[PDB]
Design a binder for this molecule. Structure first.
Ligand SMILES: O=C(CN1CCC(CN2Cc3ccccc3C2=O)CC1)c1ccc(F)cc1
Ligand SMILES: O=C(CN1CCC(CN2Cc3ccccc3C2=O)CC1)c1ccc(F)cc1
Ligand SMILES: CCCCCCCC/C=C\CCCCCCCC(=O)OC[C@H](O)CO
Ligand SMILES: CCCCCCCC/C=C\CCCCCCCC(=O)OC[C@H](O)CO
Ligand SMILES: CCCCCCCC/C=C\CCCCCCCC(=O)OC[C@H](O)CO
Ligand SMILES: CCCCCCCC/C=C\CCCCCCCC(=O)OC[C@H](O)CO
Lengths: 165, 163
């Protein structure tokens, strides 16, 4: 495996590269002041909220805000370092850091995916109206979060086993 | 003593993983397992803790908190006896990557728990901490499950006896 191994490294590199605009421009809007973001980016996030009926990014809970702070202080600095190593290739120094990132991101998203799939968004619940009401809406919203669990899982199994790391 | 700091932490982690088995099985998993699997005295004992210290998570377990409790059943509890043996015996390089995975996972589960106790509002959703002293007591009973895994992560990242 030398062509499929490098192709996975290119895929991981773009995942950590494209995560920098996504985290900065769309995700950190839930913790950073709204005055740091232009009006266009703020209205773009409201489009997503009403299109996908996301209950977490609008009125973010304290447990979700803790993960967004973890994304700013820990995950965001690692994205540029991770993209370089996987683009370059052969960087054995990224194995243990990538295992730390993979388990961390997977752990944050288990409660996130379990909330969207099972938690109740009825009028009695604290969400009070917002959120997915049908099952097709729950899959529609889960599909936005599920990449950030599968790709870190691929990275985890790729780091623990591959003798090149 | 003549154990040293390095051996003393190996023993310390062993008793941490050892005592984690009864604590998880008899107290934690009451939030995800049926009531009948537990004697009424264990359920009333946990109820005393919930009423006294105003635990909001154990009272009515939220969906996010229940997902971590299931991770404790499926992932952490099977790992507890394996890690206790590796650190009691000593010199087990095979525990490095597994214990790192446990450390990051447990630390990550505890971050939203501690942040909710400290900063969230429990006024207008069941009982919860009101005073800073009440939040401080609740942080004291959850904080060891963040510090000890953090010490473990730092212990496995750069100990040459495990690489
Ligand atoms: O919260 C995350 C990751 N988010 C990544 C962005 C996504 C929100 N989207 C998707 C989208 C598409 C088109 C236009 C606009 C948008 C838009 O706004 C919602 C999950 C997270 C990732 C890792 C982690 F550890 C914790 C949280
Ligand atoms: O949830 C935990 C750890 N809990 C350990 C048990 C504690 C709940 N208590 C404390 C107590 C004292 C006296 C009588 C009864 C009780 C009683 O019932 C509350 C945190 C956790 C640990 C690691 C992890 F990864 C996820 C969760
Ligand atoms: C209403 C909610 C009030 C604010 C809740 C903030 C939680 C994250 C705080 C950061 C803790 C994680 C540090 C890493
Ligand atoms: C166009 C407007 C764009 C808005 C971007 C918001 C600024 C984010 C900087 C915070 C990053 C801090 C990284 C420190 C890592 C610790
Ligand atoms: C629990 C929060 C931590 C998870 C966030 C992932 C951070 C990604 C990089 C970690 C490198 C840690 C130090 C690596 C030591 C070897 C160099
Ligand atoms: C009313 C709302 C009820 C919420 C029920 C949540 C169950 C979490 C179980 C799924 C957690 C999956 C653990 C993954 C291991």
């Amino acid at each position: 495996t030398l062509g499929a191994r490098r192709g996975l490294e290119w895929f991981l590199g773009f995942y950590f590269l494209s995560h920098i605009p996504i985290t900065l421009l769309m995700d950190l809007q839930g913790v950073l002041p709204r005055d740091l973001y232009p009006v266009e980016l703020r209205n773009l996030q409201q489009w997503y909220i009403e299109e996908f009926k996301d209950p977490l990014l609008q009125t973010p809970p304290a447990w979700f805000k803790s993960f967004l702070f973890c994304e700013l202080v820990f995950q965001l600095p690692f994205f540029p370092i991770a993209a370089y190593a996987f683009f370059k290739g052969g960087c054995k120094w990224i194995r243990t850091p990538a295992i730390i990132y993979s388990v961390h991101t997977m752990t944050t998203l288990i409660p996130i995916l379990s909330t969207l799939l099972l938690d109740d968004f009825s009028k009695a619940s604290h969400f009070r109206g917002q959120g997915p009401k049908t099952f097709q809406e729950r899959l529609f919203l889960i599909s936005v979060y599920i990449p950030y669990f599968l790709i870190p899982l691929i990275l985890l199994l790729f780091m623990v086993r591959n003798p090149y790391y």
